[PDB]
Design a protein around this ligand. Structure first.
Ligand code: ZN
Ligand code: ZN
Ligand code: ZN
Lengths: 66, 45, 49, 137, 263, 113, 47
RNA sequence: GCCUGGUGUCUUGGGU
């Protein structure tokens, strides 16, 4: 829905790295390299950012109910 | 008496049940109750 | 209901007499019934739902 | 025998947690020319065969407001029906399902095709994985 | 007799070698740092207004996971042990957040840096949401569009990870020993040749391989334990190792007290 | 609905002793120690320490059910020594080793600062 | 009893600071329907 | 000042 605050498996904070990850993809870096630059070395942390799906951008389009 | 909200134009107003169910501003016939006065607490777990 | 009360325990379909055996209660937290694993066979029970 | 051990700390950080929503619908029925049911908070003095649960979460319009936590058998929509031939009405209210709890999220008020009043109450709660819940690859 | 040799160090992780101790002590230190080192974390959220698209307890759930500076937490009491009526300045930190989007276009992103400390046990350095730099906005909490508002009041309390994982000061704890398997505690799975098919430990060059002739030392014990303690920034890495040892001491001390009082 | 309070793992009820010693009169000089609101964390630490002492002839523990934070330890010593005293000795040894260990880490830490 | 169904805050114990509603007040031991987890607790009146 | 009643008949989709 929105990027999780913590990695489920190990607990390292990953909720402050989502914006940095999208910017790196505009500059043409590949997904593996972008994660490497952010120092997410264990693959438990990598799944969190690599496989998250950002649905909140879709829910905000529905014109507020007040 | 009781706060409501217009489903189209979001104007707030009250109704003392016997009034017809519509928005005064646009005539929209779908309306919603506003939230309680009481404070809500959650344990953040 | 309290510890060591006997109760009759049963899984459908009751195909033979060891589908209904008496167990001793042990009260525990959480909402599932607990069985020692060696009785799964006569009930033809498993824990997939 | 096909069970599985789950990491409790993973559950704490949000693994497999989910929202659950239930909606209740009710409307006023017509029994005669001017004989209609009426949404209200029923007074114990004037209405017979009241439910055993609490009525103290209803507002004066007969409807509960969003943000209030509810538990089983609490009344969330008060409605009465008059008794044919004071002390003339009978309760026709809707209680929350006995096995549930949560927070009232949103209350729709409108009218139906026949022109009588019509409400929907959506309740939300959060279900946290626990012993006994089912999972599959 | 216990010896320590720090291989690397920085603010939020310490890599170190631990030696001349028993396996059980290295493991109990691992468990204590994960589970019993106290920290500070949000534990009560009063929502006065939330007209965002996220559900109330969803936002509250994210708040609990925000790491807070917990440096001076040892002088702070547990809420359950305080003699006062409701909360006060000695057992809780109060935080407040208020965001809003004016304008019909664009999105206002609500970040953890908008959490404002309002009170707290002065002048102890506790309760600020951890930041990497000064220009770092921090952790994403919510997103707002035109007219949507979020105004919440958060109560942070002292707790331990046994109760809920949000109070844990560590993340992972890397931990290994005997990189060449001289003790024979594992029996390697292989298809053809065990040595070629199993990768080397990242500490393979810190100990010497077994000689091709060498007989099995059935008296050798595990003796060197390499571990790396990463933290979330709620506590500095050196504090976690120190307070892990300290906490484990009082627990053993409490056991020792009870024996000399039961007679 | 039937989940117990998580704080019950470490908070002791007022009518419940943290520690309970009973005899095992079936063999000479053997006690059963029941530890309340504790884990493998404490138990494994004490157990290995005790096993290296020459006058401890038997030491063991079990966590009978993970849903209840307790464990029970069995300790038998030879005729000379009293088991309960030996347990105190094991405790003080480990407190000392951890005090030393904390000191040596602090020293090494400033050098890398 | 005059305090049933009225909102309450708990000032001592492990549930200190939490909102609730008095569900049942038979005597000395109250039943508060806590808001925060979906549980109704037995609690003494001093609290 | 104790007692305290809320439907049925189907159909459809599911679980073992
Ligand atoms: Zn991870
Ligand atoms: Zn309108
Ligand atoms: Zn206090």
């Amino acid at each position: 829905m929105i990027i999780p605050v913590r990695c489920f498996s190990c607990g390292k904070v990953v909720g402050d790295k989502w914006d940095a990850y999208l910017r790196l993809l505009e500059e043409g870096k590949q997904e593996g390299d972008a994660l490497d630059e952010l120092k997410l070395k264990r693959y438990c942390c990598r799944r969190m950012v690599l496989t998250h799906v950002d649905l909140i951008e879709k829910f905000l389009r529905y014109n507020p109910l007040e | 008496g009781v706060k409501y909200t217009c489903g189209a134009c979001a104007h707030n107003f009250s109704l003392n049940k016997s009034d017809p169910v519509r928005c005064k501003e646009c005539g929209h016939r779908v309306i919603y109750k506003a939230r309680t006065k009481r404070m809500i607490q959650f344990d953040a777990r | 209901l309290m510890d060591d009360d006997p109760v009759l325990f049963n899984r459908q379909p009751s195909l033979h007499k060891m589908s209904m055996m008496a167990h001793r209660v042990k009260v525990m937290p959480y909402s599932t019934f607990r069985l020692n694993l060696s009785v799964t066979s006569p009930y033809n029970a498993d824990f997939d739902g | 025998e096909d069970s599985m051990i789950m990491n409790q700390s993973s559950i704490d950080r949000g693994l497999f947690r989910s929202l659950f929503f239930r909606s209740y619908m009710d409307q006023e029925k017509r029994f005669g020319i001017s004989i209609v049911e009426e949404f209200e908070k029923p007074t114990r003095a004037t209405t017979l065969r009241l439910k055993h649960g609490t009525y103290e979460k209803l507002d004066e319009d007969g409807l509960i407001a969003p943000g209030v936590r509810v538990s089983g058998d609490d009344i969330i929509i008060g409605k009465t029906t008059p008794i044919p031939p004071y002390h003339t009405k009978r309760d026709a209210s809707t209680p929350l399902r006995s096995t549930e709890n949560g927070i009232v999220d949103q209350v729709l008020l409108t009218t139906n095709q026949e022109g009588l009043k019509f409400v929907k109450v959506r309740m939300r709660t959060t279900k946290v994985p626990q012993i006994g819940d089912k999972f599959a690859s | 007799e216990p010896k320590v040799n720090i291989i690397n160090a920085q603010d939020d992780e310490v890599e170190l070698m631990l030696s001349d101790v028993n396996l059980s002590l290295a493991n109990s230190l691992r468990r204590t740092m994960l589970a019993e080192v106290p920290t500070l974390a949000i534990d009560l959220v009063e929502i006065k207004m939330n007209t965002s698209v996220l559900a109330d307890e969803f936002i509250s759930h994210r708040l609990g996971l925000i790491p807070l500076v917990s440096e001076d937490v040892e002088e702070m009491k547990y809420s359950r042990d305080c003699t006062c009526e409701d909360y006060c300045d000695e057992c809780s930190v109060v935080l407040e957040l208020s965001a809003r989007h004016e304008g019909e276009e664009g999105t206002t992103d609500v970040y953890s840096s908008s959490l404002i400390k309002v009170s707290g046990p002065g002048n102890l350095n506790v309760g600020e949401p951890v930041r990497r730099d000064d220009y770092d906005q921090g952790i994403l909490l919510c997103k707002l569009r035109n007219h949507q508002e979020l105004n919440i009041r958060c109560i942070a309390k002292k707790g331990i990870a046994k109760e809920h994982a949000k109070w844990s000061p560590c993340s992972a704890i890397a931990f290994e020993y005997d990189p060449h398997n001289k003790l024979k505690h594992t029996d390697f799975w292989f298809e053809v040749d065990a040595k070629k098919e199993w990768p080397d430990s990242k500490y393979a060059t810190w100990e010497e391989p077994p000689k091709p002739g060498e007989v099995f030392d059935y008296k050798a014990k595990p003796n060197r334990f390499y571990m790396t303690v990463e933290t979330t920034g709620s506590l500095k890495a050196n504090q976690v190792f120190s307070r892990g040892i300290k906490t484990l001491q009082e627990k053993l001390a409490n056991v020792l007290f009870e024996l000399e009082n039961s007679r | 609905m039937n989940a117990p309070d998580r704080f019950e793992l470490f908070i002791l009820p007022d009518d419940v002793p943290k520690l309970k010693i009973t005899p095992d009169s079936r063999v000479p000089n053997c006690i059963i120690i029941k530890f309340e609101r504790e884990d493998h964390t404490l138990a494994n630490l004490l157990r290995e320490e005790l096993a290296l002492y020459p006058d401890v002839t038997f030491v063991a523990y079990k966590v009978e059910h993970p849903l209840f934070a307790n464990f029970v330890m069995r300790l038998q010593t030879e005729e000379g020594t009293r088991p309960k005293q030996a347990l105190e000795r094991a405790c003080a040894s480990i407190i000392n080793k951890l005090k030393t260990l904390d000191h040596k880490f602090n020293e090494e830490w400033n050098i890398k600062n | 009893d005059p305090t049933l169904n009225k909102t309450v805050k708990i000032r001592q114990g492990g549930y200190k600071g939490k909102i609730g509603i008095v569900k049942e007040a038979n005597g000395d031991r109250f039943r508060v329907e806590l808001h925060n987890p979906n549980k109704t607790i037995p609690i003494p009146c001093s609290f």
